[PDB]
Design a binder for this molecule. Structure first.
Ligand SMILES: Nc1ncnc2c1ncn2[C@@H]1O[C@H](COP(=O)(O)OP(=O)(O)O)[C@@H](O)[C@H]1O
Ligand SMILES: Nc1ncnc2c1ncn2[C@@H]1O[C@H](COP(=O)(O)OP(=O)(O)O)[C@@H](O)[C@H]1O
Ligand SMILES: [Mg+2]
Ligand SMILES: [Mg+2]
Lengths: 367, 367
């Protein structure tokens, strides 16, 4: 039989059967209602378009992201996410395969029960396991020690794990990135005349957040060469034909990740949450959290990541401490390659959630 | 029995049975009373002459177009238009056929109501639907996206539709074309000494507006070769036997369509109403409003369009944006071939206004 690794990604939900190297389906999670008068006869339309189709029919719909600060807004849209994914993307019956689901490292209750229960009664899954996204990135990297940085649009997390136990008193949740980085980029993109106010227009901002934005080596010195008239500015092209040229704001927006003063929020940067979680761990283990710092999520692919984070930590940490930050190719699919490695392993398969146990004990013993 | 497609044109009402060729009866809406005393007695002639006998017996009558600025002058003449077409052209019973009527995109309330209500109570049709004249040209052209140009004597319109929704905030109505081009032609025909002024006499001007006039490619450069002593004159023959030679004024009159300062009205050319409506639409859709510009109506049958319109848009439009214009053969009957395609389709017959529903709720829910 076949098993399915399905990641409830922040962006960028990822789905694909076990092995060999990639998700079969990746999509930007948006659901979109029709916001204008439909005058055509027929009409040949869907009641609501999900992604990909909601990313090829922008501006005639009203985009609704179904996950907001790590909570899924309603299961009415969520069941349609699931159904769409299984039937017209993966092309599989849920009863066919035991599944693998992902969750958040720090989340409220009740969100793992309600998921497990609704998916068991609605889609009639035969067995299930639900993993937090951070744990899976250890399997992908081949590590069993380290602080895990799982960063997606828009909840990041900072989890310390040591061979092979979790440190409860050192776990930090930042709501700092990344949809708020999108929202900030749109707010400092107003300075260059072309505005992108609406929900639909925000997706275009995300494409300029991917490609053109970059993290610097040091803020003060990038501000210095920005003052120079020699152009380091980059020209983006807009679907109507227009060319938008951004320069200084290009490195100002991502710098927010190490300087939350741009949002003005009271929370501290990835720099300091790394230090403050390490300096709340036991003395012996602090040695091996340094050099096993493991990054993940699509948002960590910027040029100055990890060597900004490195240079800043090496300055605050004691003299001659060995610090190297683990940055593998294609981090956006790291989590999925984790799940892929995990569910194939012998043998405590007999620690999963299964229909027979669910029949007697329901959605209890899930945390 | 079989549905009847009758389009309440701007000009130029068109009427014809369900498909597939062209309307059975077309006439330019004129009613005309006899303006001189009767002396032969009896006398075998009507109280007011309808077409086509009112276009042969010109000069003994006072011609009155009943559709003025898109408003119908009174239902006394309108009911007579209807009665004359159904009885004395088509030879059809209104009680027998579900009918299909058209109206304008932006026009005053309650002129679609009062029309629908009078046609149900006077002619006792069994079912009816009222379509805006522009939407039907999409079905005829075989597309479902684009800005629709329905241009007739005396009201043109600019409606943007995107697969298959309509933008309420982007609809532009010009009262500029075509009867004011007729009036301008009549004022510059005085320039060659022919004093043409009367209501009847205006019709002959309309025929010279069709055949002899031509749209240029660049005004200043068409004026340049006009400035050479060599002829630009074309010779028209007039019913009394006279030969009229127009040349210079020949390209001056149609140019009014892109140069409305010739009339002196504050409104801007089809060029600029296209651009200003497209750049009032949301960013993503703007790409496909370009290159799916769809022309229609008899007044667009000048050979110098669409490449005047093309060259003008290409001058204002951003670089690298493709511009193509959808312009079929026989554009005057585009709308009618639309109506034929529409009313023949299943299953939207149960979205028509039917006699039972009209009896139940009167002239409500028409829009
Ligand atoms: N090259 C890139 N540079 C910066 N951000 C990127 C890049 N590619 C993708 N992203 C970001 O990755 C985000 C998706 O995060 P995701 O990987 O889904 O997080 P997670 O798996 O933890 O939920 C997107 O919202 C997008 O902005
Ligand atoms: N070859 C032509 N060149 C220019 N004008 C034309 C030509 N053929 C017809 N027309 C014009 O078309 C007008 C009718 O427009 P029409 O298409 O009937 O308006 P509508 O679309 O709103 O019903 C007439 O008044 C006539 O002057
Ligand atoms: Mg994550
Ligand atoms: Mg028309």
């Amino acid at each position: 039989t076949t098993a399915l690794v399905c990641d409830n990604g922040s962006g960028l939900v990822k789905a694909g059967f076990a092995g060999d190297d990639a998700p079969r389906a990746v999509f930007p999670s948006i659901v979109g209602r029709p916001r204008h008068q439909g005058v055509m006869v027929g009409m040949g339309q869907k009641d609501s378009y999900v992604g990909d189709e909601a990313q090829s029919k922008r501006g005639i719909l009203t985009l609704k992201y179904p996950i907001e600060h790590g909570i899924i807004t309603n299961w009415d849209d969520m069941e349609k996410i699931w159904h769409h994914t299984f039937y017209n993307e993966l092309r599989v019956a849920p009863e066919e395969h035991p599944t693998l689901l992902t969750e958040a490292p720090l989340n409220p209750k009740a969100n793992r029960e309600k998921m497990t229960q609704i998916m068991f009664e609605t889609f009639n899954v035969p067995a299930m396991y639900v993993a937090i996204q951070a744990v899976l990135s250890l399997y992908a990297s081949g590590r069993t020690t380290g602080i895990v940085l799982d960063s997606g649009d828009g909840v990041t997390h900072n989890v310390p794990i040591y061979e092979g136990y979790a440190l409860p008193h050192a776990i930090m949740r930042l709501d700092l990135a990344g949809r708020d980085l999108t929202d900030y980029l749109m707010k400092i993109l107003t300075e260059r005349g072309y505005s992108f106010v609406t929900t639909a227009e925000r997706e275009i901002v995300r494409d300029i957040k991917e490609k053109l934005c970059y993290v610097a080596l040091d803020f003060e010195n990038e501000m210095a060469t920005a003052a120079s008239s020699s152009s380091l500015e980059k020209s983006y092209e807009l679907p109507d034909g227009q060319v938008i040229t951004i320069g200084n704001e290009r490195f100002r927006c991502p710098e927010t990740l190490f300087q939350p003063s741009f949002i003005g929020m009271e929370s501290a940067g990835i720099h300091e949450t790394t230090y403050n979680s390490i300096m709340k761990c036991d003395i012996d283990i602090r040695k091996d959290l340094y050099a096993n710092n493991v990054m993940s999520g699509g948002t960590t692919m910027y040029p100055g990541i990890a060597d900004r984070m490195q240079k800043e930590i090496t300055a605050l940490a004691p003299s001659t401490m060995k610090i190297k930050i683990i940055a593998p190719p294609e981090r956006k699919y790291s989590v999925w390659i984790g799940g892929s490695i995990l569910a194939s392993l012998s043998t405590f398969q007999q620690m999963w959630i299964t229909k027979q146990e669910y029949d007697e004990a329901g959605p209890s013993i899930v945390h």
